[PDB]
Ligand binder design. Sequence first.
Ligand SMILES: CC(=O)OC[C@]12CC[C@H]3[C@@H](C[C@H]4O[C@]45CCCC(=O)[C@]35C)[C@]1(O)CC[C@@]2(O)[C@@](C)(O)[C@@H]1CC(C)=C(C)C(=O)O1
Ligand SMILES: [Cl-]
Length: 108
Amino acid sequence: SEHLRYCDSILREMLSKKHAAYAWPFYKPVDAEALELHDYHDIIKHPMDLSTVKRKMDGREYPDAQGFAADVRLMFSNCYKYNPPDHEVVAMARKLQDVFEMRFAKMP
Ligand SMILES: CC(=O)OC[C@]12CC[C@H]3[C@@H](C[C@H]4O[C@]45CCCC(=O)[C@]35C)[C@]1(O)CC[C@@]2(O)[C@@](C)(O)[C@@H]1CC(C)=C(C)C(=O)O1
Ligand SMILES: [Cl-]
């Protein structure tokens, strides 16, 4: 759709070097074992990351832009749910979500 191509562009920007500094914790799925997070899958029941979003976007799996946003926001919400609000990862999550929400609001 028209809206989904703009979403594709948002995805490109989120994956670019421009934001890598704060975006990198969301590039690949959360490896709970490598990160020794023994409670991750108790708290987060629907994991989500940027690569999964690329898969769903490249496989034409989103019905419309609103499903795209649902998955992106879900990713962010999971980060906020799991960490306490003074962790730096939450600040990075907020920076990146600022980018996403800005670009999404400015959708033509
Ligand atoms: C990949 C990794 O190093 O993980 C470690 C860590 C995230 C990043 C944090 C790091 C703590 C501080 O060392 C800082 C120093 C400053 C900034 C910083 O980035 C890190 C490396 C962690 O905070 C500890 C555990 C934790 O895994 C989580 C819980 O925050 C998960 C990690 C992930 C990927 C998600 C999506 C989440 O919800 O949160
Ligand atoms: Cl909305």
